[PDB]
A paper describes a structure:
To expand the structural repertoire of determined capsid structures for the diverse Bocaparvovirus genus, viruses infecting dogs (CnMV), pigs (PBoV1), and rats (RBoV) were selected. The ORFs of these viruses coding for the major capsid protein VP2 were cloned into the pFastBac1 plasmid to enable the production of the virus-like particles (VLPs), using the Bac-to-Bac expression system in insect Sf9 cells. In the icosahedral capsid, the 60 VPs assemble via two-, three-, and fivefold symmetry-related VP interactions, resulting in pores at the fivefold symmetry axes, protrusions surrounding the threefold axes, and depressions at the twofold axes.
Canine Minute Virus (CnMV) was first isolated from German military dogs in 1967 and was initially thought to be non-pathogenic. Later, it was found to be pathogenic in newborn puppies and fetuses, as the virus was found in the lungs and intestines of nursing puppies, leading to lesions, diarrhea, and death. The high resolution of the cryo-EM maps allowed the building of reliable atomic models, starting from amino acids 34, 41, and 42 (VP2 numbering) at the N-terminus for CnMV, PBoV1, and RBoV, respectively. In contrast, the CnMV capsid shows very prominent threefold protrusions, while PBoV1 and RBoV follow the previously described characteristics of the genus. The more prominent threefold protrusions of CnMV are the result of significant insertions into VR-IV (+1 aa vs. BPV, +2 aa vs. PBoV1 and HBoV1, +4 aa vs. RBoV) and VR-VIII (+12 aa vs. PBoV1, +13 aa vs. RBoV, +15 aa vs. BPV, +17 aa vs. HBoV1). The lack of any twofold depression in CnMV is caused by an insertion in VR-III (+2 aa vs. HBoV1, +3 aa vs. PBoV1, + 6 aa vs. RBoV and BPV) and its loop conformation advancing towards the twofold symmetry axis. Another feature previously observed for the bocaviruses, with the exception of GBoV1, was the presence of density extending into the interior of the capsid below the fivefold channel. This density was also seen for CnMV, but is absent in the PBoV1 and RBoV capsids.
Residue numbers in the entry:
A (entry chain A): 34 to 571
B (entry chain I): 209 to 312
C (entry chain I): 365 to 468
D (entry chain I), F (entry chain B): 521 to 571
E (entry chain I), J (entry chain B): 105 to 156
G (entry chain G): 417 to 468
H (entry chain G): 313 to 364
I (entry chain B): 34 to 52
């Protein structure tokens, strides 16, 4: 029935492919140590960074990656057989809890099971506590179901080091000092305010969640946005040409070629900034296409001066890297820069080799390589009537920076097997269109973070100082996501490109080696990206 | 064919005596009702930069490129971001950096 | 719009109607909301221009970083509207035009 | 609002006003109004919003 | 000023729902100058136009 | 409370606190507590009571 | 320096040739003649901005 | 220009996937990506008009 | 149900402000 | 601290009505010194006296 000696659940796993739904059940073996010695402590970054925050005696389940949910073949069969997919509903189950005590009886350490020790488990569904989980973090659910998963210590941003800096001395209150105020109005969160469960070995718990999100599109456009037309018909439109290069000139009109027709569809947005590669040795300064210094109006961030035009505190571009936070990749709809923004490793905690994979391959023609703008004649106009031309002029130029504009249509980046699934959309009042250059699906309320700490069992002391019993929790978590899928249909005659393994460069991959080392892809193609062969009529 | 001649011709002229409306005396009164359809007015602040919300306790999976030799033979060499510096997908909201004319 | 660094620039107004006594001009200085940004910098590559030959050392100096003064609307932008004082207008008439962008 | 924040928020107290006599009539009946933006009690002061 | 303070301190957000205006206690006065002085006497049966 | 008072009341804002970092843990985990009576947010601050 | 008179001349005003999409923009689409196309195929792409 | 089939238009767009080399292309040494000169791009690209 | 290995309760906390 | 602030700012007066205390998740540990070290092991069937 129930008790210390009957299991709360069993190992579930596998996948079910279906026409309208895919259901991926996954179970892992996890354990949570005592984090930070059961205490909230101020977290300050070493080196030069002004990030300051709280380190928390808690740890959390991060379920956000694809490769954690799909196996390599479940991924392949997913991307090959389906046009698009999104999650519908997720159900996590935390069970088979076991709490072990760590005692050192001698030089040796012995691990004996202490019943009646609890574990705190808290799912924040309302997101009342800071959501500090980031996509592209190394603490997600392991892709190998037989690897044990160590939960990650939780912590959160609190205040900005250089926005608390100036004149914050506590001698007397300064109400007009704005940096004094930022530090005063900075929050501090404690997870013991919240109602949450305490479980023992016999107890279990589970959580359900219903996604509301966009899709993940697996099909490619074979045609440029502007190239889809019929050369067999002649167009009705003419293009203007200046004739005499002077004031007496006028535009003379001649018909476009059938093979060159104008279009109403602009290129999707992009920023032509590739990020800083200066060979800077500091890893914590901002190296990124767009670095953003958040400072409130009265504040002085790091070393700041007043621009005398606006009389506002501003920074030099070199100092800003200290005070600011990069955003990458910003390339958005430009596929020419795919290689710039994303580079990542699959292998967690492996000091053996880097195995850095970069997104090289995109065959989707709805994403553009370059945009050129051409504003007139190649030679400046003479101010007199008659006359011949003038000083030479730059007719054409590359547009590096393409912002959002009407009639823009593009496709999001192809995602590999190991990417994050979703990203937390900010709780700000205003949002523009959601397109993530890392391919993630921003959601207003993503799955609530599940926090775990180990109940604190005190040790009586004569000195009355805090002494806690050293013990940890291990258990089993089953994450079952239900995925809404769409099978593709096409009238295309020719065969599509399917993400075969034959294109892999390394023969032995997704398999263990002699010593048990699981071989993972070091390349983006070997990660079986989406948007490969399935053609999409423009 | 004069277009400015046309703008003046097609400019409107409005008179409020075309419209049905009430005429009241000292004994009479009137009232009006209206139903708003509008957005909100938000009184709460964000304490965190859009790009600063992350967990330094976990190490990121992402690397940043660095050019090495400053010539054609060069290539990007990749190294991991610091836990305290992580890239973000959230751009800054729009702005125009023009402060207006102060010429006296 | 979303830049709070320039809050002091755009709005200055008086509360006191029809008072010739004193100006009493109030300007919006205080915004503690961190979802609004002070500056945006863009950095496009290495600090020294590339030499066209293989090998070789660097080249002419190059401007690595620059401030982006003008930030237009772009995907994945999130920000917060300006804090309003007690004496502001409540609403504004949206034009009767066919097309509208985001309201901020 | 509802929050799990532990620390106290900044509430638009009058104690931060620079002028003591404000929002009140004077000897001749002149109603004293704020000449500053803080004294006009702006929004978005203390209530914290998890990002 | 206090309704504002209590509004901004106690509430996360607000918007208007519905407004109702009422125009009443109307009084129409005539301005006549009988001499150097100006005297204000109430003329009944004088209308006021009100248009929303 | 309900009041017909026109002027704004004094609300126990944190802006009047002398110490910026308060009611929050430090580097070693020491929770910083008020050493002053105002920083303890006393009652009977702004709410006016007609005598 | 403090005090001092002005400095080097500066360009106060400039024409903005390129105006991208920005909050609080309102405009009207082009007037169409009798002989124009009625409609146009919107692409089957995932993302679209405002249609003008 | 006497060529009717080259791109004459306010915005000409060269669609090339990352590894591809379109017409006569060189590698920008900053980003190490294949790019084209503005003159060659008209060969490889498609104008959009009007963009006004 | 009950016994050495099932918890008697859980962590409760927070506050509810009301009129 | 915030529940206090929001209490004192938003309310004219307060008093307690009813309190409910719950003592649960009891755990009784034995302290034994097997050697120079002290080890803490859980002894079931040990009671605790609770008297209100």
């Amino acid at each position: 029935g129930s008790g210390v000696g009957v299991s709360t659940g069993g190992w579930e796993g596998g996948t079910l492919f279906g026409d309208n739904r895919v259901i991926t059940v996954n179970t892992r073996q996890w354990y949570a140590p005592i984090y930070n010695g059961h205490r909230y402590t101020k977290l300050e970054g070493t080196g030069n960074t002004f990030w300051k925050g709280i380190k928390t005696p808690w740890g959390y389940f991060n379920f956000n990656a694809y490769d954690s949910h799909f196996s390599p073949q479940d991924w392949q069969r997913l991307t090959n057989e389906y046009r698009r997919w999104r999650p519908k509903k997720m159900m996590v189950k935390i069970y088979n809890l076991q709490i072990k005590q760590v005692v050192t009886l001698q030089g040796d350490t012995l691990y004996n099971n202490d019943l009646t020790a609890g574990v705190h488990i808290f799912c924040d569904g309302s997101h009342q506590y800071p959501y500090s989980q980031h996509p592209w973090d190394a603490g997600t659910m392991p892709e190998l179901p037989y690897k044990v998963w160590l939960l990650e210590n939780y912590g959160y941003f609190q205040f900005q080091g250089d926005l608390i800096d100036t004149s914050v001395d506590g001698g007397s209150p300064d109400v007009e000092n704005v940096e004094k105020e930022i530090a005063k109005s900075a929050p501090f969160y404690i997870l013991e305010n919240a109602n949450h469960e305490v479980l023992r070995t016999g107890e279990e718990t589970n959580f359900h969640f219903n996604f509301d999100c966009g899709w993940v599109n697996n099909d490619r456009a074979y045609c440029p946005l502007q190239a889809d037309f019929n050369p067999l018909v002649k167009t009705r439109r003419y293009f203007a040409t200046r004739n005499n290069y002077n004031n007496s000139g006028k535009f003379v009109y001649t018909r476009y070629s059938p093979y060159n027709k104008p279009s109403q569809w602009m290129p999707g947005p992009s920023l032509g900034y590739i990020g800083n590669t200066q060979s800077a040795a500091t890893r914590e300064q901002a190296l990124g296409p767009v670095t953003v210094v958040t400072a409130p109006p009265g504040t002085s961030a790091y070393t700041a001066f007043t621009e005398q035009q606006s009389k506002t505190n501003q920074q030099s571009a070199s100092n800003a890297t200290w005070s600011g936070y990069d955003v990458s990749p910003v390339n958005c709809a430009r596929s020419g820069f795919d290689k710039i923004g994303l580079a990542y490793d699959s292998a967690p905690e492996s000091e053996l080799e880097e195995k850095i994979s970069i997104r090289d391959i995109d065959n989707d023609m709805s994403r553009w390589g370059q945009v050129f703008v051409q504003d007139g004649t190649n030679k400046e106009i003479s101010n007199d009537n008659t006359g011949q031309g003038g000083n030479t002029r730059q007719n054409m130029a590359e547009l590096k920076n393409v912002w959002m504009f009407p009639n823009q249509a593009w496709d999001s980046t192809p995602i590999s097997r190991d990417f994050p699934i979703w990203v937390k959309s900010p709780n700000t009042d205003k949002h523009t269109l959601f397109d993530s250059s890392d391919g993630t699906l921003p959601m207003s309320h993503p799955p609530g973070t599940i926090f775990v700490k180990v109940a604190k069992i005190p040790i009586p002391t004569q000195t009355n100082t805090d002494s806690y019993l050293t013990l940890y929790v291990t258990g089993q978590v089953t994450c079952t996501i239900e995925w809404e899928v769409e099978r593709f249909m096409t009238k295309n005659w020719r065969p599509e490109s399917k993400n075969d393994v034959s294109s892999f460069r390394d023969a032995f991959l997704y398999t263990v080696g002699a010593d048990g080392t699981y071989n993972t892809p070091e390349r983006f193609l070997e990660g079986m990206p989406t948007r490969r062969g399935i053609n999409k009529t423009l």
